[PDB]
Structures are given as C-alpha cells and as structure tokens.
Amino acid sequence: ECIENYAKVNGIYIYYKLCKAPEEKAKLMTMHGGPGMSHDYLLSLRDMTKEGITVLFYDQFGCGRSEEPDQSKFTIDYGVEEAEALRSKLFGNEKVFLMGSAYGGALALAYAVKYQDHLKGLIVSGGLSSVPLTVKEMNRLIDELPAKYRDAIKKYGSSGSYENPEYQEAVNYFYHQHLLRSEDWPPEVLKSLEYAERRNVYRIMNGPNEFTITGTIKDWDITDKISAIKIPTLITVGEYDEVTPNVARVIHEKIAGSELHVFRDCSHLTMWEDREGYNKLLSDFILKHL
Numbered sequence: 001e002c003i004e005n006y007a008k009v010n011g012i013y014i015y016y017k018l019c020k021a022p023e024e025k026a027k028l029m030t031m032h033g034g035p036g037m038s039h040d041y042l043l044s045l046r047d048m049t050k051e052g053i054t055v056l057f058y059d060q061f062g063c064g065r066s067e068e069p070d071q072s073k074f075t076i077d078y079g080v081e082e083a084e085a086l087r088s089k090l091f092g093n094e095k096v097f098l099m100g101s102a103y104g105g106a107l108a109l110a111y112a113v114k115y116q117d118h119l120k121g122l123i124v125s126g127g128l129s130s131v132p133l134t135v136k137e138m139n140r141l142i143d144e145l146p147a148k149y150r151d152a153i154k155k156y157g158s159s160g161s162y163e164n165p166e167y168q169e170a171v172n173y174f175y176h177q178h179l180l181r182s183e184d185w186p187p188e189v190l191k192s193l194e195y196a197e198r199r200n201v202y203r204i205m206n207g208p209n210e211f212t213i214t215g216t217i218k219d220w221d222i223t224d225k226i227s228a229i230k231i232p233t234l235i236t237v238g239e240y241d242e243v244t245p246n247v248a249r250v251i252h253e254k255i256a257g258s259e260l261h262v263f264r265d266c267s268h269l270t271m272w273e274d275r276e277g278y279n280k281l282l283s284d285f286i287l288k289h290l
C-alpha cells in the first residue's frame, strides 16, 4: 500500500501516489501519457520497489483525480513547471530519475531540457520529441492497415464522425495492434483510458484518439533542444509501438550516450506486454547509474 495524498502545486490540487522502500536506492518520478490519461496504466512499474526503487506516480493537471487549471494552462510548459514544483515540495533538493511514457516522454524531455540538473537519469518509453513526426509515422501505420479500417479512418475521420461504428472498429484494431497487443487488457490501463474520455485534457490537448492529433500540441517539436540533455538516458520503444522506433530513434540520435531498446512482440504499453523484461531493464539502468 503506497501513500496517497493531494498536493497543492501552482494553486491547484494534484493527486500523487508514492510507493517507496524497502532500502530505497533511488527515487523515480513518472509521467503518464495522453495528454489527459492518468498514472493508473503505469502502475505495473510498482514492481521496481522490490528492486530498491522508490516510485512516484501522479495525475498531471486536469487528469485522473487532479483538478484542472485555467484552460490557458493546458500546455506542456505548464506541465513542466507543475512537475518541478511537485518534485521540489515532496523531495526537496534531492535529485531524481524521471520516466515519461508517450506524451509523458515528451513532457519528460521538455522537463530535462530546462531542469536536467535536478535529475540523475531520464527514461523515455514510446516517447517523442516531435508531434508532427509522430503524426507522420502513425499515418504510415494507418496505411499499413487493411483497406476497410484504413478507409473508415479517412472517410469518417475527415467528417469528424469519430462516433461512427466502423471508425471505432478501426480504432480498436489499431490499438490492439499498436497500443496494447493483448486481448485481456488490465483494469489499470482501462482506467486511464476511461479517465482520458471523462476529463477534458485529452480532448483539448491531444484530440479524439491516439492517431488523431488535432489538439493544441499538434505543432510541438523540441527535437532541436533535446540535444542539450547531458544525463544518462534510456529510450525504450515497442517493436509495433504506435510511436514508432523511428520516432524513438530521433530522440536517440540527439541524446549522447543514450541507449535505445526495441522490445520485440511489444507495442506501446510495453510495461504490460513484457512486464518483467520492462521492469528488469529499467531496474538495471537505474541501479547502474546511482
């Protein structure tokens, strides 16, 4: 049982769940994806507490159980300041390892660019430094889909008929192929998905679904800045990840000494497709960089 509480950061109440000890060797801040999902689907990383890794989960502004600020603050830059503020008034000056998943990865990168001096290492899983490049790669994945689903996406997607039954069918197919290659999805993942739909962050910042980024972050691209990251960096990406290894690669080319690990038979949520392998890899990376 981890410690759960509300923390008032930039004027709002942000929910966080801290799982630590025994014999804590390091702390790990985690940034769920979306934008607009929740920490819930990242819960499998809890397996690293028995490896001496203290894991910190938290719902970003307007996500899960956290309240949302003024819509004018629905940006990655604010997410960065929120993140630092949380780290500060929870761990103080202590340096920590930051892990970001998907959008969380993007956020982690934006964070590192400005506050890498507060970190000992950075982990990006299915992350990205450029939304446009991510869009491009996803369109390719959509083209590789069977004509039926590929046509329903362009057909109903161009008219904004995201509620269409044929479209939703194409979405599920794509997800079972690039989001989670499993038939029996865990409650944690499903809860993050439900949170995305029920709140307003995903809709505004991201868009309708995973591969339809019509949100306010559609032009975001810090590929040029991420080259300043001078800390141990681990980059993981699923073989069939919706955020392709091509996107992962671009981040790998930018961060010197960074490592890239492409999980076989895995897609986006590699923490559930290969839970042990994923946690083992992160555990080893963290433990060899104290």
Ligand SMILES: N[C@@H](Cc1ccccc1)C(=O)CCl
Binding pocket: 033, 034, 035, 037, 101, 102, 103, 104, 131, 134, 206, 209, 210, 213, 243
């Ligand atoms: N929707 C994914 C990845 C993504 C983010 C932002 C734009 C496009 C794609 C994430 O953030 C959820 Cl796990």
